[PDB]
Design a protein around this ligand. Structure first.
Ligand SMILES: *Cc1c(COP(=O)(O)O)cnc(C)c1O
Ligand SMILES: *Cc1c(COP(=O)(O)O)cnc(C)c1O
Lengths: 396, 396
């Protein structure tokens, strides 16, 4: 049965991990997968998280199955984080949230739900975008189209090409938007552009689907949700796939959420029943530990205060490396100006390096980045900055 | 977009949970979902598990993503549990294991993998079987056929109808087998019958797929794997979807595994690469906490000793309730003989009650069981046995 199966192509992001643990050459620098590192180059467990785990160990009395949609409190805290404490969406009970296994899990559940319960056939994604986006929607049987987004020449958001590109999007098509910290460009729309998009969306009849995996890494928790809230104010329906992997440093516990919004509570309830059916035939019910930690933290004023500060520390350290990176490149005799990197938010940065330059950095210097030229600034430390910049200068 | 979505039908098993927490009538008795309860009617965290969680809290230094296939040690301990310490399958490196989110997750991953990488089009399942089996395979686009299994009249395994029924299975079809503790009948094939099936399987060219969610609940860890090992000895290829939800009482942490076996290491490696591709487009990587606990326990002689005993205690308490159940029914003036229930293993028992009798038990007595007449013996306690049996006698 398995004789003729072909070897699957390596994942553009996850595949780097395999190359790393196969490279003896010490001094390696990992700027691939989007994981936060502190000044030491380690990815520690947040203190707020350890304290929540301590709490769960002392108070958990059973591991009995959670409902298909997960921990209710988790869903509530998630909705408040997304739409705001006194949001009308919450008061009118127009939103239902299912706890899922990571942000990827949320996107997959949204995909399956749409494919077998709606007339949706096309999903529009930005060019460029997280590579797994196309793969997930295609796996559900949905076709993916791309819309212009990044201006490679000016290293900015080409809003005119975006709008014009989307005119090709028909009513009933899904349009995916990154909530903030666009992966891989790091370029997000301004508040006015979001408002223009929200308006256009309603008029063209698109179904907005937000991928929110970096809330808190651009400017702040509330500020980072302004774009989504602009859409939520004019739309009757939308879908939000969120992730807590990065802002809680809970990567391997797979904590995410898929939020569904409809015109009213009776409609979202009916729709949600079909979303739960899609979960039952996938993994049945979500993993408790990770989500339990997030709910415990967000619902406790003491722990939430600590967590919010740790999040602020992470954002500020990336902003510092982003600065040290640009200065060191210049200081090390960089060819061109990389000041544009200062205007990008999040862990990433589209460096502008070609595939060959990325390959050479890996082959000759032990510097690992994604073939697209995407680099994880969060993987930069005051200690590896020098050799990293020297390697980059050598390939320019 | 969501205006015309229809309400999904309630899950035959999970739906009971909703009815329970909507029923004021105190004294309710839950014999539905397959969850273990102790003499108190509670589902506690195993002591071995709490100790492992204590260990993880003190020693975990990062929550960084696990590989797509999960924790390597977990995979190793799983293979040893399934095939045996000195198994040839392990020595020849013919098996690859992916850590998944529960046993359901393992079945879904196996389904997706088969649908897009093989010529498989049909999956044969026993009549009756866990209801979610048909739903999971159908969701992957595979058709499901049923083969005779249970003799409703004699309350035994009709081996002749099974064999004859399977002659309709073509080479290249998948045939699903419950490793032990058949859900819902509790009737498993004898070792000689397994051997006859293994032989027939090889000859007809079927691809065996074992659902192993109750290892340790029939006779013991090793004894419960005799059937699978009989197949593993004659087959070049097979798939095993296992679950640790029940034997570790880790239901809500979603810990399972999907093991793939091929003729040789180069073939299983190629095949496995495609299985990982299927995981990447679903939930990306598995939840660490649950599996970490299982690996910590199984790899530590001290903790494994405690866990094995707790497992033995669970099996023995169900065997006692199975006895007290039959005796009390007789003692309470039961109509017919339920001695056949003593010959069934696992948490369940196909009681023989009709759908109406099950509905009446729920409506008039607050006793909840699955419409098929399946009852969770593990939910019976010395305290609820009397009222439970009185209710059953009243509907006979
Ligand atoms: C990290 C990320 C996700 C989801 O990741 P999970 O690890 O599954 O939580 C989704 N979209 C983008 C753009 C991401 O960066
Ligand atoms: C419990 C069970 C499963 C899988 O359950 P998970 O909770 O997803 O681990 C699969 N098959 C049968 C027959 C089961 O009883």
């Amino acid at each position: 049965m398995f004789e003729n199966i072909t070897t699957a192509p390596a994942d553009p992001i996850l595949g780097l991990a395999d190359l790393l643990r196969a490279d003896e050459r010490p001094g390696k620098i990992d700027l691939g997968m989007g994981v936060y590192n502190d000044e030491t180059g380690k990815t520690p467990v947040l203190t707020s998280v350890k304290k929540a785990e301590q709490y769960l160990l002392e108070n958990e009395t059973t591991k009995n199955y959670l409902g298909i949609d997960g921990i209710p409190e988790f869903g509530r805290c998630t909705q408040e984080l997304l739409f705001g404490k006194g949001s009308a969406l919450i008061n009118d009970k127009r939103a239902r949230t299912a706890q899922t296994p990571g942000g990827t899990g949320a996107l997959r559940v949204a995909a399956d739900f749409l494919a077998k319960n709606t007339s949706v056939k096309r999903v529009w994604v930005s060019n460029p975008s997280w590579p797994n986006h196309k793969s997930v929607f295609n796996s559900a049987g949905l076709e993916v189209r791309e819309y212009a987004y990044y201006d490679a020449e000016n290293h900015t958001l080409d809003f005119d090409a975006l709008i014009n590109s989307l005119n090709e999007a028909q009513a009933g098509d899904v349009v995916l938007f990154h909530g903030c910290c666009h992966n891989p460009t790091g370029i997000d729309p301004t508040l006015e552009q979001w408002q223009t998009l929200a308006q256009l969306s309603v008029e063209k009849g698109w179904l907005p689907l937000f991928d929110f995996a970096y809330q808190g890494f651009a400017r702040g928790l509330e500020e980072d949700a302004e774009g989504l809230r602009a859409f939520a104010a004019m739309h009757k329906e939308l879908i939000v796939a969120s992730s807590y992997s990065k802002n809680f440093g809970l990567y391997n516990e797979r904590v995410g959420a898929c939020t569904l919004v409809a015109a009213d509570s009776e409609t979202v309830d009916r729709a949600f029943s079909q979303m739960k059916a899609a979960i039952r035939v996938n993994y049945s019910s979500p993993p408790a530990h990770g989500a339990s930690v997030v709910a415990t933290i967000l619902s406790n004023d003491a722990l939430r205060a600590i967590w919010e500060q740790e999040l602020t520390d992470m954002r500020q350290r990336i902003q510092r490396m982003r600065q040290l990176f640009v200065n060191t490149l210049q200081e090390k005799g960089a060819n061109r100006d990389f000041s544009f990197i200062i205007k990008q938010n999040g862990m990433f940065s589209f460096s502008g390096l070609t595939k060959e330059q990325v390959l050479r950095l890996r082959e000759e210097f032990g510097v690992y980045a994604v073939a697209s030229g995407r680099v994880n600034v969060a993987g930069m430390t005051p200690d590896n900055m020098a050799p990293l910049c020297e390697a980059i200068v050598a390939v320019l």
